PDB file of C-alpha atoms in Angstrom:
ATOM      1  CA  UNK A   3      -2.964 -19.377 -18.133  1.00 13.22           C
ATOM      2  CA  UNK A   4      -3.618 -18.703 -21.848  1.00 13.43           C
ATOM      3  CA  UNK A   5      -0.706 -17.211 -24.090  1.00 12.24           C
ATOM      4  CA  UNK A   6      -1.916 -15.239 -27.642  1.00 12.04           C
ATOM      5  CA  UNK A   7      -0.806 -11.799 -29.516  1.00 12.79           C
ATOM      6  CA  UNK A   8      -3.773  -9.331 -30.087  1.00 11.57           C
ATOM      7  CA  UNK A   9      -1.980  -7.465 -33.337  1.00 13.50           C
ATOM      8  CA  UNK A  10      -0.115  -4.422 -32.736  1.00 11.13           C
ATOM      9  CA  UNK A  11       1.845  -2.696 -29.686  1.00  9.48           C
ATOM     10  CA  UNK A  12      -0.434   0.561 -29.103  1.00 10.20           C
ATOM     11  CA  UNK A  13      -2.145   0.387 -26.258  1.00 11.00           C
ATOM     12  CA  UNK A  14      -3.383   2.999 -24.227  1.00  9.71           C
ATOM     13  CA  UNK A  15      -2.383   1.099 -20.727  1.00  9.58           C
ATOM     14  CA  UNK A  16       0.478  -0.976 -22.239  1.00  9.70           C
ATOM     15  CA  UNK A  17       2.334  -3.093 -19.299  1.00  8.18           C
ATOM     16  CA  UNK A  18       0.431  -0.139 -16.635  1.00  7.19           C
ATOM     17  CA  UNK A  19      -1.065  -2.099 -14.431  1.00  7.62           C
ATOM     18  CA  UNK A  20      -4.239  -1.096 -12.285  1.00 10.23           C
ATOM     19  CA  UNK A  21      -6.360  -2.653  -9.592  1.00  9.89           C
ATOM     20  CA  UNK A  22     -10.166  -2.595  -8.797  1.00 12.96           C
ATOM     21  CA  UNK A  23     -11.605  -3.104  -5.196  1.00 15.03           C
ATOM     22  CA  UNK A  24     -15.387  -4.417  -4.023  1.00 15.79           C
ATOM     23  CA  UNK A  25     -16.195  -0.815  -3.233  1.00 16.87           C
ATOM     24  CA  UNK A  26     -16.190   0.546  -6.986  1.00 19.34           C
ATOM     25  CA  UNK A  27     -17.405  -1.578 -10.383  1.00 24.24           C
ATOM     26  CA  UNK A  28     -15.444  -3.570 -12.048  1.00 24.57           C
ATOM     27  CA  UNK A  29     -17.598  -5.067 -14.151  1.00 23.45           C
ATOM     28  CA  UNK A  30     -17.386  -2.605 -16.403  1.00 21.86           C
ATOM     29  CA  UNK A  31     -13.611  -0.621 -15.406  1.00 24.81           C
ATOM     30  CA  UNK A  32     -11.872  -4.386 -15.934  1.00 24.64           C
ATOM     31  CA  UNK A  33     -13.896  -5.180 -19.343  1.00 25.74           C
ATOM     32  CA  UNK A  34     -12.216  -1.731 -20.825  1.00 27.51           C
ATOM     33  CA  UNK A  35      -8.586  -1.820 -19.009  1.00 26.71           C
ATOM     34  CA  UNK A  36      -8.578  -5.006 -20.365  1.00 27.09           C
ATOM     35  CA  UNK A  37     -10.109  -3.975 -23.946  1.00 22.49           C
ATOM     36  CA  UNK A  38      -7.259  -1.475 -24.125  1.00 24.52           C
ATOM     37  CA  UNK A  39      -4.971  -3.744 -23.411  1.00 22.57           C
ATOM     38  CA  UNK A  40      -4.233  -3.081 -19.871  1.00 22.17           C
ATOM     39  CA  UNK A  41      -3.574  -5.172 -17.261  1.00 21.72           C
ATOM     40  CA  UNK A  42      -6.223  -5.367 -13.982  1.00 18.27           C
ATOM     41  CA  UNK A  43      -6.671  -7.667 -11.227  1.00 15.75           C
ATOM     42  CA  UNK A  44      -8.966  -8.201  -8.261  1.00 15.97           C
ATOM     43  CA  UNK A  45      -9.132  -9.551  -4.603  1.00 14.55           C
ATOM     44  CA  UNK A  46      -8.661 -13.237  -5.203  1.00 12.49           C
ATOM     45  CA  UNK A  47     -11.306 -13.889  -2.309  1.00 11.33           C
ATOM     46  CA  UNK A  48     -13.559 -11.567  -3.663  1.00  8.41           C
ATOM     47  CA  UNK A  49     -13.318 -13.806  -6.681  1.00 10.34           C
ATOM     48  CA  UNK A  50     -11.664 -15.845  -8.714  1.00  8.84           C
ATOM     49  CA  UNK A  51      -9.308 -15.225 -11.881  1.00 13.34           C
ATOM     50  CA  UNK A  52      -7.152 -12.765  -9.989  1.00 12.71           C
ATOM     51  CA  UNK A  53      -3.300 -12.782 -10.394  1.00 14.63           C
ATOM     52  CA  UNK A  54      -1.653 -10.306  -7.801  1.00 17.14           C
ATOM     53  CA  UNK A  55      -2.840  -9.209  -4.923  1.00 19.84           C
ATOM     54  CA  UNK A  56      -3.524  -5.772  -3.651  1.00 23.96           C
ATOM     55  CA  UNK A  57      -0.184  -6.177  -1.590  1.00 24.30           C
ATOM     56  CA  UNK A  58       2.397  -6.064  -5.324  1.00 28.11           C
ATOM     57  CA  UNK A  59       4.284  -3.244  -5.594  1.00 25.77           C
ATOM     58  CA  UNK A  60       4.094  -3.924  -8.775  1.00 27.85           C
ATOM     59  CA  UNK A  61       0.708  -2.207  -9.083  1.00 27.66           C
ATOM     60  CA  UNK A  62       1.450   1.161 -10.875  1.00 26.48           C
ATOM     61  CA  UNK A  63      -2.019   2.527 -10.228  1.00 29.46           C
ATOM     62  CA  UNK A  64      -4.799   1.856  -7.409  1.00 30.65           C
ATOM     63  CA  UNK A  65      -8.464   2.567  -8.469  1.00 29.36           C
ATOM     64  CA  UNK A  66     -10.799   3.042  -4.725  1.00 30.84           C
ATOM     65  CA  UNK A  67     -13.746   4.730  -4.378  1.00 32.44           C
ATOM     66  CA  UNK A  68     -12.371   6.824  -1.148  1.00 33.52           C
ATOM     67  CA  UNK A  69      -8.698   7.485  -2.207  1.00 36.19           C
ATOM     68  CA  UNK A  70      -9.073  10.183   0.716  1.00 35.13           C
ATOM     69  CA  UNK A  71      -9.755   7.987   3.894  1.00 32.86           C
ATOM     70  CA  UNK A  72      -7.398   5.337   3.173  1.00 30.11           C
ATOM     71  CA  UNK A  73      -3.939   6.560   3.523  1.00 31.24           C
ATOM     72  CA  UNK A  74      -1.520   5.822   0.114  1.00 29.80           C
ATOM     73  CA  UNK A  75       1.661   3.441  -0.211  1.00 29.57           C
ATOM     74  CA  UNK A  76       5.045   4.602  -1.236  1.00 24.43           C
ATOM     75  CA  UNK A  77       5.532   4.352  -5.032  1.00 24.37           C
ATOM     76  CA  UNK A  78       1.512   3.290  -5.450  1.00 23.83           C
ATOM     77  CA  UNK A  79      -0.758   6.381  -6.163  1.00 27.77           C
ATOM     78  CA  UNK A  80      -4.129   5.850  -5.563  1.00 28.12           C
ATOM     79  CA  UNK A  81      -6.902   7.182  -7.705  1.00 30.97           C
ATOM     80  CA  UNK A  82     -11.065   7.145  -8.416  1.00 31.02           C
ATOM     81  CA  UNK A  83     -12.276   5.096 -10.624  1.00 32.11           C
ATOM     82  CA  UNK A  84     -13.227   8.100 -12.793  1.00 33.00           C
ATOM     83  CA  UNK A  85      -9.764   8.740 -13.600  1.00 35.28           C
ATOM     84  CA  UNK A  86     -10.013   6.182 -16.013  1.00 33.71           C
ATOM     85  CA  UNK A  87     -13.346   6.557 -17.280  1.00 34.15           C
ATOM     86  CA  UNK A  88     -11.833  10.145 -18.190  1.00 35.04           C
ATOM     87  CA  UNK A  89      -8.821   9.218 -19.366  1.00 35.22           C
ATOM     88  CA  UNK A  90     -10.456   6.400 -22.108  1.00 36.04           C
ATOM     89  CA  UNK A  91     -12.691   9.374 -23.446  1.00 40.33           C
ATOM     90  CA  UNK A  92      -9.760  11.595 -23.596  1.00 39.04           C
ATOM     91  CA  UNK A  93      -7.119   8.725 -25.105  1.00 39.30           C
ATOM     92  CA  UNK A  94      -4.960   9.826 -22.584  1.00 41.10           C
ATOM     93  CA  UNK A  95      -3.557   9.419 -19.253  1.00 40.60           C
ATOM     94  CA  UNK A  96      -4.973  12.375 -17.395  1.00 42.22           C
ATOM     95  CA  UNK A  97      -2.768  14.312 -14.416  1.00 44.17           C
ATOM     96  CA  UNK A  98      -3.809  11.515 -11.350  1.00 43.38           C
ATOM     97  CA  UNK A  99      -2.934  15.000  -9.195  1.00 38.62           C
ATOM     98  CA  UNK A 100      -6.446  15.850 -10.157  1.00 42.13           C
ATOM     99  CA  UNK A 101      -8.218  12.560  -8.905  1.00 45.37           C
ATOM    100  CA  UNK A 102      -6.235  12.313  -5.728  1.00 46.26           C
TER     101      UNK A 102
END
């Protein structure tokens, strides 16, 4: 692992942590997260450079692309991945009661 400070403590996703699956982009979700100092992991299989896995309570936030057909975990609230998109426009965590 690499340690470093990036300047200041404002961050839109500040310790929130998220989690991307092989069904929507991440490509492009874990390049902002991660820009706005967020924290964002994937499937370790899927490929490597992953920390936890999709099985960490931890997790405060679960991006999927059908939040609908796969059922939800207690504590973990599952959301699109256009929650975000939304929210990084709006600098601000939009109501995931909309996008579930």
């Amino acid at each position: 692992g690499s340690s470093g400070s990036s300047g200041k403590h404002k961050k839109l996703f500040e310790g929130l942590k998220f989690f991307l699956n092989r069904e929507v982009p991440r490509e492009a979700l874990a390049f902002i997260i991660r820009s706005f100092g967020g924290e964002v992991s994937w499937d370790k299989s899927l490929c490597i450079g992953a920390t936890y896995d999709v099985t960490d309570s931890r997790i405060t936030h679960q991006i999927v692309d059908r939040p609908g057909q796969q059922t939800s975990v207690i504590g973990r609230c599952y959301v699109q991945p256009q929650w975000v998109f939304d929210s990084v426009n709006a600098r601000l965590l939009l109501p995931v009661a909309e996008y579930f």
